Design a protein around this ligand. Sequence first.
Ligand SMILES: Cc1cc2nc3c(=O)[nH]c(=O)nc-3n(C[C@H](O)[C@H](O)[C@H](O)COP(=O)(O)OP(=O)(O)OC[C@H]3O[C@@H](n4cnc5c(N)ncnc54)[C@H](O)[C@@H]3O)c2cc1C
Ligand SMILES: Cc1cc2nc3c(=O)[nH]c(=O)nc-3n(C[C@H](O)[C@H](O)[C@H](O)COP(=O)(O)OP(=O)(O)OC[C@H]3O[C@@H](n4cnc5c(N)ncnc54)[C@H](O)[C@@H]3O)c2cc1C
Lengths: 393, 393
Amino acid sequence: SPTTDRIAVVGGSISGLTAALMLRDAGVDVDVYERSPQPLSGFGTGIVVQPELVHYLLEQGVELDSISVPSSSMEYVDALTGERVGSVPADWRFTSYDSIYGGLYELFGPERYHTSKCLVGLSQDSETVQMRFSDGTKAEANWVIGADGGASVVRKRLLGIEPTYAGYVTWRGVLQPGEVADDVWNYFNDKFTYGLLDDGHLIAYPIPGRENAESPRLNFQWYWNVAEGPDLDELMTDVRGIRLPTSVHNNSLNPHNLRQFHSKGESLFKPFRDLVLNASSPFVTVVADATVDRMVHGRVLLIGDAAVTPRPHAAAGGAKASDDARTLAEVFTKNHDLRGSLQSWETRQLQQGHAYLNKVKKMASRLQHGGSFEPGNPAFAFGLPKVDEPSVV
Amino acid sequence: SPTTDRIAVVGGSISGLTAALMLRDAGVDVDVYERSPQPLSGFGTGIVVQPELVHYLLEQGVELDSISVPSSSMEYVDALTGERVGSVPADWRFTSYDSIYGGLYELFGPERYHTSKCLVGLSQDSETVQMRFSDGTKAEANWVIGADGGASVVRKRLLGIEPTYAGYVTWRGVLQPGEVADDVWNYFNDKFTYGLLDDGHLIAYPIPGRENAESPRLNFQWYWNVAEGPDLDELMTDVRGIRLPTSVHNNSLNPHNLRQFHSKGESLFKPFRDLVLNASSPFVTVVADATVDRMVHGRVLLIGDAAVTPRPHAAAGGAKASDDARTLAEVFTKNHDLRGSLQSWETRQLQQGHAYLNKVKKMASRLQHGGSFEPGNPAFAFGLPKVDEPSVV
Ligand SMILES: Cc1cc2nc3c(=O)[nH]c(=O)nc-3n(C[C@H](O)[C@H](O)[C@H](O)COP(=O)(O)OP(=O)(O)OC[C@H]3O[C@@H](n4cnc5c(N)ncnc54)[C@H](O)[C@@H]3O)c2cc1C
Ligand SMILES: Cc1cc2nc3c(=O)[nH]c(=O)nc-3n(C[C@H](O)[C@H](O)[C@H](O)COP(=O)(O)OP(=O)(O)OC[C@H]3O[C@@H](n4cnc5c(N)ncnc54)[C@H](O)[C@@H]3O)c2cc1C
């Protein structure tokens, strides 16, 4: 028998829904509380597919070829002069935030996914955890899973930890067929491409169409080093004067920032220049990370970006989150000495979490500084670091 | 001859408009850039009248009795048990933020008061200062006066200084005739009243009607000590989940916070209890202060809450701001060795500014802790500290 305990999940995205689904599948009584008034949106941005990230969906019968897009190499290019550093065979598939989210939400349904529930307070005793929401209501559970992302309030309330700026930001853009010339489309299609600079880099790869039937798109990012203080403050302030914590979305950019994005883009080697100048809704997001010594805090658990908050470079953040969710659900599934199992659980997941953070840190120290970033370097490959013993394929 | 230089004023409130008006009066070419899309609003809150605060208006023919309201004593009461600590004769007049602002704006006019201009960047050389706005435009001046208030961006960009939480917040409420019983209205009318507690205090005083012809109102505040971190974070988070920096306005309160305000209010001695329970739009504002060693930074000057950011206890913040503006305008009026005069100017205004901060700090250490706060104590009287030699009345 799975637990007869009541579980609340705060945060209804990749980790939240994964946790909930698996607990619901297992008979566990579970609720999701999501700050968002409606079901979600990633603004059509790319996600590199890892096993862990699509594990749940595949288990339910979703065909991989239907939520993702192939590649057959990985390219390394000087993004100023176009000089090719090198290319290696590769077969990453790429999906989109909407594809994963939309798949998970579709499976879960609205009945117990409580929108407009923004946690703002939390407290706990030996039986239960009380949650308080910004709408003035409260819910109660035996266990609460903080699946509330990089700016996790749960983690802020328990530990005082918030993301620390990493020194740089990333512009994010998505192109549709015909928004760039065919030869530029062909340059990036069916490939992950790094455009490396002396002080930053771009990445580009194909992704699925916004809806089932639509054509594939090109996803790209450009990482800029921006000095904390005046410089970052001016980049992160929207057209209305609010200095935002994480992203300034396209419809809100200070026009000056948008001109700067285009004008710096003017110096890039043609095909990258064309991504930057032709994107219709580019937007900007800080790079910030955070860590945590424990994921277990009495009856409150942290998973996904709310435990260790990653940087995007190894393209497995959402995979770390799914795994956190899966292993956690399994604990309440197996339901044998919860205190003990959770201790064992967090040890593995912390080591995974810390190792992932170290990798993307090392990656960033090459990628943001024109440091050597060698084609095919196994230390810099996408994916979660091996934490388990290897098994037979 | 006043300067032929071009002056820009960033921030269009009490200090901004005062500066601008006096410079315009003197022939100086000046512009105001205000973040706000429309002319302003203080949400009908009280301001105790000081000479400095109404100096400009009176000089223009505005009659004091028409923008303010009398009192004939100052009362000191235990706000739990109603026991009167004491009363002293007094003749403070009280006005409202809207009364002062509305008077100043009316005199200045829209022509050179540029709304929707939120400064987000600043830089300067030996001739000029360039201002950059959140709308992507820029203006240029010879001198820039940072009149942008407690959360001054100008001061943030030049110095890295922002307000520091002081340990407490103040609830703010305004009552109209008939929203409380007549005997409660009569209790507070024509008086400034302190309701003192073991760990905080209320103040109440009459103020003018929202419009020329309307009846007088009752303004009140209740200062609560709220621990930085989880507690303050939950108080300062609005119904939508945003943790706000300064105020959570009534239409946005987490209903739980509003219930808490009412429920704690339930323990007060009747007439204070009635203010708190009957206010229709109470709202909350952090108490935070900041200081500055210089008000002169090349060609950028800080005045009002953007130089030394006060706490409200001596009820002369807006007076400090007017004075900062007046003395500064005078410098450009007199126009004789600007570098030298500005050095002399800031010395006086800093001493005034620091002394004011020390006073309200000392006041707070009594008023938020049930410390002794003796009726009529000259050290705790409202007003700016004497900085000049005394003159003949
Ligand atoms: C630029 C970029 C590129 C990326 N590329 C990849 C990639 O290639 N591969 C990969 O695996 N990952 C990638 N990721 C990482 C992946 O996006 C994240 O790791 C993942 O979305 C984290 O899932 P999560 O549910 O833990 O947090 P989130 O997705 O951030 O969701 C947390 C949820 O909680 C909600 N919430 C927040 N606060 C509250 C609260 N107070 N109360 C209630 N609800 C709240 C939010 O609304 C949100 O729905 C990328 C990320 C970015 C930024
Ligand atoms: C609870 C309370 C009670 C008070 N009681 C009294 C009293 O009894 N007596 C008294 O004298 N004073 C009192 N005050 C103090 C008085 O309100 C302030 O000292 C005064 O309003 C400061 O004037 P200011 O123009 O310097 O700043 P503000 O009034 O804060 O105005 C600054 C202006 O700049 C604008 N701005 C901000 N940032 C930007 C930017 N980025 N770009 C462009 N514009 C920007 C804002 O919109 C605002 O209009 C009280 C204050 C409070 C909080």
